[PDB]
Homo-oligomer: A and B are copies of this chain.
């Protein structure tokens, strides 16, 4: 046998992508790309291939050199969608990257050379899927700058990933199922606007599965935290829940949650099915804007937002016995930080009243809407600060 017959029929889908530009100086960048919609002339490539482009020219196997338009990109997943206006365009069968196993055979194909290598401008390498799982297919089919943005295909010649050359036998591809959904969102909207759900997940290993009361082969995503006032908390999610489904996607691996949710639209209602102590629950959460949530959090805690605070009592020369609330941390976006509070500060009075524990400070902080006057001890000195 040979992989040559399958490669022959999909080669017209693989294009060369040439970029000219200026960086924050003059450069050129060559990679590959894959035609994923031949009727509308949509081509996927890597974001790193096209970043800072002034110009992008696509070359097909048949020799035509086409001016390409950027539909949009997404640096986080290193994908970009391009459009060319042409006819007589070919694609390939799109596969399901969720069905991929370690040990399956694959070919990585690019078209690094374009027109002066016409009829032999493509480049193919052979290996296996070496590992799965930010989330990438890993292969021993050498993947190199030439061929980054090109096609990883399975043995039946179906597209299962987009090659990405990062950085020595080992290469990486972005799995096609994620690619499909990033592309579709870029086409509709021009960029991915990621929102917030507010939960961390971890891999449910057979060992944790059994220690939590589930069979050793039970699958899903283990929820390790739900943040206060997040969409996930509102929906009723709790730590220790196992997520088994998000909307219509069956969840068998923690990586799929981040994937499936990351690209939902701010405003969307999402259905989440969990197991909690062996009992199934259906929950519903609304994805929110990350910046709108952070504004909410500030609004409801306008003075103490972003401060890590603990009770404190300590003989502290030359101040005598110091009783107060120690600021262990302060985010630089806080009203506290802006007023001048810094980690290590001890809050010893607030609106002219003594502070003993964190709760006493929180109660005082609810006194005025306009400002909070804090007296802070900082090493051997002190100062009054107005947090507004």
Contacts and interface: CB of A to CB of B under 8 A. Distances in A.
Contacts of A169: 125, 141-142, 144, 168-169
A373 interface: yes
A281 interface: no
A93 interface: no
Given A206-B62, A306-B317, A142 B120 contact: no
Interface in A89-134: 101-105, 107, 113, 115-120, 122-133
Interface stretch (A37-45, A183-191, A258-266, A327-335): A327-335
Contacts of A24: none
Given A224-B381, A315-B310, A64 B119 contact: no
Interface of A: 1-8, 11, 20, 54-55, 57, 62-65, 67, 101-105, 107, 113, 115-120, 122-133, 138, 140-142, 144, 155, 168-170, 200, 202-203, 205-208, 211-212, 222, 224-225, 227-228, 239-240, 253, 297, 304-311, 313-321, 328-329, 331-333, 338-340, 358, 362, 371, 373, 375, 381-384, 386, 388
15 contacts: A1-B155, A2-B101, A2-B104, A3-B128, A4-B101, A115-B340, A125-B127, A125-B169, A144-B169, A168-B169, A207-B386, A224-B384, A305-B317, A308-B315, A317-B331
A384 B103 contact: no
A225 B382 contact: yes
